[PDB]
Amino acid sequence: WFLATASVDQTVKIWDLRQVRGKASFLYSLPHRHPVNAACFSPDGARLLTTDQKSEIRVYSASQWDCPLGLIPHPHRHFQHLTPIK
DNA sequence: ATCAATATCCACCTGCAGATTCTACCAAAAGTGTATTTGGAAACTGCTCCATCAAAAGGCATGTTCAGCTGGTTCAGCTGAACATGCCTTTTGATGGAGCAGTTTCCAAATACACTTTTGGTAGAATCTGCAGGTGGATATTGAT
């Protein structure tokens, strides 16, 4: 009963699907400098991976979603006819 | 190598045309204050830039062949720099006096500025045709012979 979603708005949002109903009465919001191509949870559940379109990877933790633990810089640049990277 | 001839740089050095100093003004720089005008930080919309992967068309890196150009040599003219000489167009240096550069007066001719009223020049949606492209064949052009 917590959810993750990613968007071209340069933000990635963590929801609580049972509690929220109010059109962005969300739980947490993490910003970025560029768009996001993927936001995938762990198997254990405590580590969120996030992957942008220009050059970055971020790891956010269970503990205080806002601040990141670590950045893994690596270029996976976006392109029209290319399949986006995950 | 050397030594005579001409041209060139360098120490002494002086009176003055050009450089600098100095008065006395007033036509430009700032202050104060105000009225007017802007460039750049938030929203939003619609072209069109980032530069992968198959499939295919056509251009180039390589190698091969040889004729005709480069660029070196030798040389018969020829022509243009040096120069003396005279003399004669210009250099300084004055003097006149006519008239254009330039200034001032002022107002008749030409224009901004602010408003209202036409209007045609410009997107966008329906029609056209000259030329891209194709097809094909006669004559002009290179070149072997």
3-state secondary structure A26-77: CCEEEECCCCEEEEEECCCCCEEEEEECCCCEEEEECCCCCCEEEECCCCCC
Resolution in A: 3.9
**Residues A59/A35, Cβ–Cβ less than 8 Å:** no
Beta carbon of A75 within 7 Å of strand B? no
Technique employed here was: cryo-EM
Please report, rounded to whole angstroms, the spatial distance between the CA atom of protein residue A9 and the C1' atom of nucleotide B74: 87
Residue A79, CA: closest nucleotide via C1'? Answer: B50
Task: Return d(Cα A7, Cα A33) in angstroms, integer.
Answer: 12
Residue A78, CA: closest nucleotide via C1'? Answer: B50
As given in the structure block, the two tokens for residue A24 are 């962005």
